[PDB]
A paper describes a structure:
M. genitalium has a flask-shaped morphology that consists of a cell body with a protrusion of the cell membrane, called the terminal organelle, which is the scaffold for cell adhesion, division and motility, processes deeply related to infectivity. M. genitalium MG200 and MG491 proteins have been proposed as components of the terminal organelle wheel complex ultrastructure and in agreement with this, it has recently been found that MG200 and MG491 interact with each other specifically influencing cell motility. In this work, the crystal structure of MG491 was determined and found to present a unique tetrameric organization as a dimer of asymmetric pairs of subunits. The structural characterization of MG491 in this work, indicates that MG491 subunits are composed of three distinct regions with a 60-residue N-terminus, a central three-helix-bundle spanning about 150 residues and a C-terminal region that contains the residues that interact with MG200 and appears to be mostly unstructured.
The structure determined for MG491 subunits consists of an antiparallel three-helix-bundle, with helices α1 (residues 70–102), α2 (111–145) and α3 (167–203) connected by loops L1 (103–110) and L2 (146–166), respectively. Helix α1 is kinked in its central part, due to the insertion of a π-helix turn starting in residue Cys87. Therefore, about sixty residues in the N-terminal region of MG491 appear to be flexible with respect to the subunit three-helix-bundle domain. The four MG491 subunits found in the crystal asymmetric unit present three different types of intersubunit interfaces that were named symmetric, tight and loose. The symmetric interface, with a total buried area of ~650 Å2, corresponds to interactions across the two-fold symmetry axis and involves only subunits A and C, while subunits B and D do not contact with each other. The tight interfaces, with a total buried area of ~2*1200 Å2, correspond to the two interfaces between subunits in the pairs A/D and C/B (within each pair subunits are related by ~72° rotation). The loose interfaces, with a total buried area of ~2*450 Å2, correspond to the two interfaces between subunits in the pairs A/B and C/D (within each pair subunits are related by ~108° rotation). The organization of the MG491 tetramer, with only a two-fold symmetry, can be defined as a dimer (C2 molecular symmetry) of asymmetric pairs of subunits. Loop L2 mediates interactions in both the tight and the loose interfaces presenting a different conformation in each interface. In the MG491 tetramer, the four Cys87 residues (Cys87 is the only cysteine in the whole MG491 sequence) are located close to each other, in particular across the symmetric interface, suggesting the possible formation of disulfide bonds between subunits.
Numbering used by the authors:
A (entry chain C): 66 to 203
B (entry chain B): 67 to 203
C (entry chain A): 65 to 204
D (entry chain D): 62 to 205
Write the structure that this text describes.
Amino acid sequence: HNFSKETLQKQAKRGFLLLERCSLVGLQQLELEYVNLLGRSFDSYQQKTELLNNLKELVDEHFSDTEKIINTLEKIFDVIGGSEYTPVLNSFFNKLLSDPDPMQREIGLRQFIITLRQRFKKLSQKIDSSLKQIETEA
Amino acid sequence: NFSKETLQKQAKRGFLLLERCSLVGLQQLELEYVNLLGRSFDSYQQKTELLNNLKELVDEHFSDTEKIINTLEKIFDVIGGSEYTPVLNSFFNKLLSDPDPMQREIGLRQFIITLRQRFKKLSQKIDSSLKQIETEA
Amino acid sequence: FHNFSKETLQKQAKRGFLLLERCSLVGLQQLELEYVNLLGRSFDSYQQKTELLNNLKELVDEHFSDTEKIINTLEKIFDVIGGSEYTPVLNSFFNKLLSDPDPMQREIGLRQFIITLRQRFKKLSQKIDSSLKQIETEAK
Amino acid sequence: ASSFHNFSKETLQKQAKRGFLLLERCSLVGLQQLELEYVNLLGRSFDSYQQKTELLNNLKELVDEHFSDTEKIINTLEKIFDVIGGSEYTPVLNSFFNKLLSDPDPMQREIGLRQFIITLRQRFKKLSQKIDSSLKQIETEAKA
């Protein structure tokens, strides 16, 4: 309740562009980097494990940064959610963020967040699986 | 020496550097490191070289970051504990937008710390890796 | 480009380079990883595996081509402002020279980046072809 | 649709230019992203099928949407050329995708632009084609 309602719109927008252009793009890399590690035959194990932990640490870090953004974005919606001031975003990927109806643009954004979380969670989960699989194999 | 509200405006600009430029660079570098590890191809002489290279970049950036922080601390020497602590929407800390200026000061200090932690932690890994590789030949 | 304002060219050169860094290279990094990812996948079949490489190959060639086009324009720009003060300044996080005060260095930096980029692209297409041969002989 | 013969010939130049910067800086960039997104989907093992198919349809829809927006721009750009085509007023554009748009000769700049359009269309069509192939491949992979 502290800022101008349209300033929040502008912020919300910026916030979201982070998620799309930075947060998600990092995540796509990381998913691929994981697969890449698995592909590298056996190495030793001490060496393989190390690289996952290493990966894991980065993913947790980046997930955390992502969450912080989301969090600030949700807090913004605490004011402009269910309002006209829901920002408009020509995303190439979720079609709803450009929708003329602000309800839809809200939905769109919530979806994007969920999706993003799903994917992050799902990655940390695989990495942990792999680390257990390797643990027991050694 | 300067107008108390000019310093506010500067502090704000200073901080937007940290968030929008310093941190973003750091996030990239963290990812670049991981990327190097992932790459088999090379030899070792070639692998090592790329880390040193990375290392140099990180130390360079860390240095630039420290310089900003330093200026920002100096600014707070004046407007710390005051009403003129700038207000910043931010996606990395909720306190910078807080109506209470004390909180906004705390927020900023936290951000700095967190940043330093991350930078230090990276240079540390890079050095570990460089030793690991050293011994592996 | 013998036609444009020397500082307009600076601004263009800069924009050109941000493409390479922020778009061209970022795509390339993903593609390299996508290749490795394909190799990692069992079972699929073969008809299905090959198809996905060709598919990848096509994209890489396409994106390499787009990258070359940019470079090309960038070289043409340097035909004018190469060896000049108007060489653009770029805080890249990756090549340190593009921010150098000396414009000679900034030129060198840029040339290096290009080379590096080409190396990486060429090297990828070459692996993909190897793999496609390896697979060809392993099946048909 | 409409026609332009009536606007100021240099206003059209300015518009044509703006129109083209859309294609280069927005339309093409979107397309490059989409091509990469497709490849990315194929790469993903994990999910199911109902889930895989869905994401393609989704992609497909986006591509058709974007292609449509692109066509609309082109269309306007062609209409503009109906007037300033074969003229001196063909706009001048530095470009990283075609060397001809900066050419001093306006004939060349016209050629350049036409080429860019074509190329763009080729790429868009080619993507929708692959996506449809993939969707059939997946469809048949469900069976007895």
